[PDB]
Structure 1
Amino acid sequence: QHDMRRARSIFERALLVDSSFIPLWIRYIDAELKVKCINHARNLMNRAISTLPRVDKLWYKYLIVEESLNNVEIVR
């Protein structure tokens, strides 16, 4: 429906039920990125890797995103 604020609220309400669920985190990061909202996804990937630091896929997701934008200081 091209309404991004309701989709953000629904994803946040979806995380409040179950934060252990990784495909929800990955969809919400991708749903930020595909509409070209990179800073929202940076805040989101920060909150993801700081919530669940022992999960490998989240750090690697944030490393892919910072490589794809060519930000080598951030990847280091």
Structure 2
Amino acid sequence: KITDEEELNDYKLRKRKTFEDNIRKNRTVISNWIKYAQWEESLKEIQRARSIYERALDVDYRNITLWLKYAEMEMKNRQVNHARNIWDRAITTLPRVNQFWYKYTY
């Protein structure tokens, strides 16, 4: 059982160290990136997760589910205009992926 925010920040230190180490190990396949972004969005610290998805798109910008998770995080957390920018950049850089167009017109 966790007390006040010192032990909470220690738990966050251990988890972020584990995820950043997994990123340093692999630097490829996005399951580490997505899991670390989901863990950061689950604690309502979504600016960390915005940075995570931007780093992961710097790694691999042609991976369409990464775009889908980043835009559905920004739709889910009521940040409409962020997600709107994300879908516009998505349909600009990947114009043949119909997933982005269907979800953005939806």
Regarding TM over 0.5, the answer is yes
Shift of 1:54: 1.1
Pick aligned residue for 1:36 from 60, 78, 82? 78
* Matching of residues 1-76 of structure 1 within 5 Å: 1-64=43-106
Amino acid corresponding to residue 12 of structure 1 in structure 2: E
The structure with the largest alpha-carbon Rg is 2
Runs of 5+ consecutive residues of structure 1 not aligned to the other structure: 65-76
Aligned-CA RMSD value: 0.6
For 2:100 and 2:94, the matched residues in 1 are separated by 8
Which 5+ residue runs of structure 2 have no aligned equivalent?
1-42
Per-residue deviation, residues 5-36 of structure 1 (Å, max 9, x unmatched)? 10000000000110111110000000001111
Report the CA distance between 1:38 and its aligned residue.
Answer: 0.4
TM-score by length of 2: 0.59
Identity of aligned residues (%): 53
User: May I ask how many residue pairs the two structures share in their alignment?
Assistant: 64
Per-residue deviation, 1:47: 0.3
In structure 1, distance between residues paired with 2:98 and 2:47: 29
Q: Secondary structure at the match of 2:84?
A: helix
